[PDB]
Amino acid sequence: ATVYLPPVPVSKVVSTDEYVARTNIYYHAGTSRLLAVGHPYFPIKKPNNNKILVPKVSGLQYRVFRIHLPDPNKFGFPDTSFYNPDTQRLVWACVGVEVGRGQPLGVGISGHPLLNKLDDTENASAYAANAGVDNRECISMDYKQTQLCLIGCKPPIGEHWGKGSPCTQVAVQPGDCPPLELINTVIQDGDMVDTGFGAMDFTTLQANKSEVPLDICTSICKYPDYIKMVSEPYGDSLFFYLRREQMFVRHLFNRAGTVGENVPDDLYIKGSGSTANLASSNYFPTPSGSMVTSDAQIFNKPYWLQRAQGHNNGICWGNQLFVTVVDTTRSTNMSLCAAISTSETTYKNTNFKEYLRHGEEYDLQFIFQLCKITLTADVMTYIHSMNSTILEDWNFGLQPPPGGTLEDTYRFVTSQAIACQKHTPPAPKEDPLKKYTFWEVNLKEKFSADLDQFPLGRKFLLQLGLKAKPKFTLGKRK
């Protein structure tokens, strides 16, 4: 520049598929399986202390991993360089991923010993059974079936309705629901999916703090904010998503507690008896999970990334991948027991102490394409306007210093002081993370160049070149 920052773009934003050439050099990577054994309901901590002994792990929460990748320009190379390192720079493209489940078919489960529930109002049994002191019951559910996986390279955006706070312009008091304002935030590991009360916080909306389970009270519940993400052309925040979700209405119920609502008292006619009074108009549909089937598994089959939502196809502008997984369908909870004493020789429920765990597996197989971004002066100006940090990291002119001189604290040694001594010694240092809240997967040298002996690999050779297998695949008929 000038002209001008550039032009044009904006408008029309140049794709990274017009000057970023693919190469036929392939490396292969994968993980060694991942296993995390939690307690979905709550983490089990030592209550004499504050540290976890069993974490919280669940498929009914987002499992969001921050994958850090090498860069090809760190290599000594096996000789993948035939040109000057300043006419081009190298970046990865990920062209296939399979995300495996090692968990059997069967659901996980959540619940609450005191879920806020009055009476049954699907078909009556009461108007109220209580409006004084207590009325909550032992009730469990498995939250709705959600399967989705989505892949990006910058952090995903979630939406949820946060607490818009009661206003005093229009009459809303405590004991009236607030106006609700949508407060959107990044999807991060440990966070709960939508429950079908809407996707909202429950940490400060809830004030009994015991309407719902131990798990969702203490999370933010979120719905994916597809909408802002698919409107970024580049799609660096995601360049792949899919979903399958469903839920059915188990039974209508009424919440524990009295109306806070204002009912116009002129939309009915008064009765006599039971029909004189009103129940609480705080009806809620009770939701419940769906039937699990092996034809609903979007997993253990490969998601290609040869093409992507974004201009991005896994192109490294940080050398990171974000992979978010939800699987509620193999999120088996396995039940077990240990006997408290062998002093009790009869069957007692004060003898054999039931315990639940959830075991969580994930494996990710990857095929990596080596790609290049060819740099001319004009290209370099576009990137500079785009994100300057990329140029510096690559290393590219024009840098000051010099620099110099003197220094201080001279001779001796100490020696007393003299001399100097100021002293004064440097670097706190401080501070931004940039962690933020993710299950760290380091890949740096799991990279390969054979892909005939990885299962994903074999299928990728089949798809790409129509060879090699190596001998044969399938049937026939069968």
Added chain:
Amino acid sequence: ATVYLPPVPVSKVVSTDEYVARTNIYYHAGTSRLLAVGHPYFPIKKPNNNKILV
């Protein structure tokens, strides 16, 4: 100093086959019917001997 430095690859082992030439001679076999009729709730064993009753 790094390491990596490709090499790379990991890894390449021999194909089970690549030179299996299928002869046009074929044979057939079979079993007559394999059957078993048990008890689905529990093995019924004879306690005096050690052998199944069902």
